[PDB]
């Protein structure tokens, strides 16, 4: 067993390289993606922001949905920072929703466990929902906060 072994790891890949959060589409439109950031940078940096993700129909956007007329190029954005916490930034032309609740555009919001963001509101048939999966590993790391010392 040589080549087959390589395939086994293919399906069973060690997840948690440095993942911050995971975006999962429940409405079945966009493929699941994994948001990640540097722990050292997050732990060391506690001002302004560390690493933010942009989502939308734009190929530049960290998240590629498709091309919804209602949704904007970069419908929403997610920023990671604070004292070991995540933030959600809405950046849509029509607005970004959280569990049916519309939040203030370009506004910072505290992340939620298995939270969900709805977008494209205006038409019952033109709304798209997304789910946010927080990596428990990232949280556990912060709770322990390892020290970086040479030798």
């Amino acid at each position: 067993a040589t080549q087959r072994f390589l395939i086994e790891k293919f399906s069973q890949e060690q997840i948690g390289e440095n993942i911050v959060c995971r975006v999962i589409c429940t409405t079945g439109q966009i493929p699941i993606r994994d948001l990640s950031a540097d722990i050292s940078q997050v732990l060391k940096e506690k001002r302004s922001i560390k690493k933010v993700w942009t989502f939308g129909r734009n190929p530049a956007c960290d998240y590629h949905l498709g091309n919804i007329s209602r949704l904007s190029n970069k419908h929403f954005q997610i920023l990671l920072g604070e004292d070991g916490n995540l933030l959600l930034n809405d950046i849509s032309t029509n607005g970004t929703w959280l569990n049916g609740q519309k939040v203030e555009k370009n506004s910072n919001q505290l992340l939620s466990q298995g939270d969900e963001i709805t977008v494209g509101v205006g038409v019952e048939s033109d709304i798209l929902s997304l789910v946010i999966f927080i990596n428990d590993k990232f949280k556990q790391c912060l709770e322990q906060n390892k020290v970086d010392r040479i030798r």
């Binding site: 209602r70 190029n73 032309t93 205006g122």
Partner: peptide, 10 residues
């Protein structure tokens, strides 16, 4: 192609 503004209840 560009973003179109949806309706809004004032």
């Amino acid at each position: 192609n560009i973003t179109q503004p949806t309706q809004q209840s004032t």
